[PDB]
């Protein structure tokens, strides 16, 4: 009679850890949410088939407002699993659900899975050099979010790389592309004019990490802003000062202009 | 003709993903390295039994100096797997190994797995608030390194969390304990006196991330410095100012003192 938070990983149903699969297979009830991220290489059927259990999908409202009414009650008399894309506690507010479980007398366990936060390593940028992260959110009505622009500025001044999670509106099947994120950032630049994000800014795009052939591209905004990086999900990265081997990787593996091999120490 | 970089995950042999396991089983040759880290919850034998292939272990020198003479030759006429703890390419020098593959006319693919960079989300600390990461190294001889102290300073100064990796002697199987890390930092604080790490500093200790029963403890240095966090490996985190939700999780899940709800928020 416990609750398991089990990550499903980056791209398809095979990105779940063996540990997660074995445990998921032996749970009495299986719940899941697919609004915090997008697993572009799988479907509900494939996941249900792999786990061998019927999966009840919950909405953001079901979770944020009724987790303790839909999931926890069952976690008292049975073993329950709650599945999520990537790692369940990364760039989500799911950690708080563990507090709800405790207060309801339910013990919980977390089974990790590969996350986009560490998968950034495939870009060649040293992961320890990443600074504060941020999310490029879709403007809504007259409200136009811009704090993420300041994060980049803060990190850049320190020579640190900036990881930019991109917005997602699962109910509308909307997945922000790196292209759209670049557009929004250029608009904020005109606004603030801090010289933080312009056509000459070097950026890195990682799309569909977890698949065997993810799209990894590096170059100047003026050149990538209109490039096609394939289907979502995408993440955008604004590197800080580059190490020679980081630049070499971006050129050799990500197709960056050979000129970035020259670093301005 | 193909080299697969496969992550083994966090703690035991089941932390590898289903994708990683199936691919490894289809490879003609399987190599592994355990100098960047060492699965404390398993053994070479258990990993070997799980994959069903003999696993040739490579030293740091085998990889860094001879990757192209040991692994790549076989990758030309067979499918080869290179196993590493955590997520492949997180370790700073691994990314360039892909450049070596390319240079040798060998295609490479990356199979991700849980990394400590994302697993620390289990501490309840928001992932986006983490800043630059660092490693606490043992002083020795006339060398007393202290850069990790400066990292904590720059991060905390901006309200960001600092993820600290603790020194490890893979060969001698010696792990630096969180307790030892604190002592070193207090000693560095006495040296630099910047008001960065003192007895009143709040810290979080994560041990055996990945296992079903990890150790998650949060508190002030004066109380945790002599606490027993169990067997390695230990990860230390110096949080920046907390979001009430982070503090609540640390209190309810990591046994942190109520005091953080008013002092560190
Ligand atoms: N496979 C993938 N490839 C590229 N970006 C990804 C991705 N998975 C997640 N993301 C990025 O992260 C956002 C979701 S944020 C939630 C992240 C998740 N808990 C994890 O551990 O990965 C997406 O909108 C996208 O910008
Ligand atoms: Na980081």
Swiss-Prot record, chains A, B:
It catalyses: 2-[(3S)-amino-3-carboxypropyl]-L-histidyl-[translation elongation factor 2] + 3 S-adenosyl-L-methionine = diphthine-[translation elongation factor 2] + 3 S-adenosyl-L-homocysteine + 3 H(+). Pfam families: TP_methylase (PF00590). The keyword Calcium does not apply. Gene3D superfamilies: Cobalt-precorrin-4 Transmethylase, Domain 1 (3.40.1010.10), Methyltransferase, Cobalt-precorrin-4 Transmethylase, Domain 2 (3.30.950.10). S-adenosyl-L-methionine binds at residues 10, 87, 90, 115-116, 166, 209, 234. Keywords: Methyltransferase, S-adenosyl-L-methionine, Transferase. Its EC number is 2.1.1.98. GO terms for biological process: methylation; protein histidyl modification to diphthamide. GO terms for molecular function: diphthine synthase activity. Pathway: Protein modification; peptidyl-diphthamide biosynthesis. The diphthine intermediate is not stable in vitro and readily eliminates the trimethylamino group. It is not known whether the elimination reaction also occurs physiologically. NCBIfam families: dph5. S-adenosyl-L-methionine-dependent methyltransferase that catalyzes the trimethylation of the amino group of the modified target histidine residue in translation elongation factor 2 (EF-2), to form an intermediate called diphthine. The three successive methylation reactions represent the second step of diphthamide biosynthesis. Belongs to the diphthine synthase family. HAMAP family: Diphthine_synth. Homodimer. This is Diphthine synthase. It comes from Pyrococcus horikoshii (strain ATCC 700860 / DSM 12428 / JCM 9974 / NBRC 100139 / OT-3).
């Amino acid at each position: 009679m416990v609750l398991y938070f089990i990550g499903l990983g980056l791209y398809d149903e095979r990105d779940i850890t063996v540990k997660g699969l074995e445990i998921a297979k032996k749970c009495d009830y299986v719940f899941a949410e697919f609004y915090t991220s997008l697993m572009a290489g799988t479907t509900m059927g494939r996941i249900q088939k792999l786990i061998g259990k019927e999966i009840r999908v919950l909405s953001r409202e079901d979770v944020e407002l009724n987790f303790e009414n839909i999931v926890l009650p069952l976690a008292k008399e049975n073993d329950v699993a709650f599945l999520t894309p990537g790692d369940p506690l990364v760039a989500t507010t799911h950690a708080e659900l563990r507090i709800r479980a405790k207060r309801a007398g339910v013990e919980s366990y977390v089974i990790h899975a590969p996350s986009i936060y560490s998968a950034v390593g495939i870009t060649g940028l040293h992961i320890y050099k990443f600074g504060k992260s941020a999310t490029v959110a879709y403007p809504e009505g007259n409200w136009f979010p811009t704090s993420y622009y300041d994060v980049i500025k803060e990190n850049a001044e320190r020579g640190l790389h900036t990881l930019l999670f991109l917005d997602i509106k699962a109910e509308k099947r909307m997945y922000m592309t790196a292209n759209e994120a670049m557009e929004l950032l250029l608009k904020v630049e005109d606004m603030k004019k801090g010289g933080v994000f312009t056509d000459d800014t070097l950026v890195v795009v990682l799309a569909r990490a977890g698949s065997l052939n993810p799209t990894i591209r590096a170059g100047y905004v003026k050149d990538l802003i209109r490039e096609d990086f394939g289907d979502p999900p995408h993440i955008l990265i604004v590197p800080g000062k580059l190490h020679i081997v980081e630049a070499e990787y971006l050129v050799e593996i990500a197709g960056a202009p050979r000129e970035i091999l020259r670093v301005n120490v």
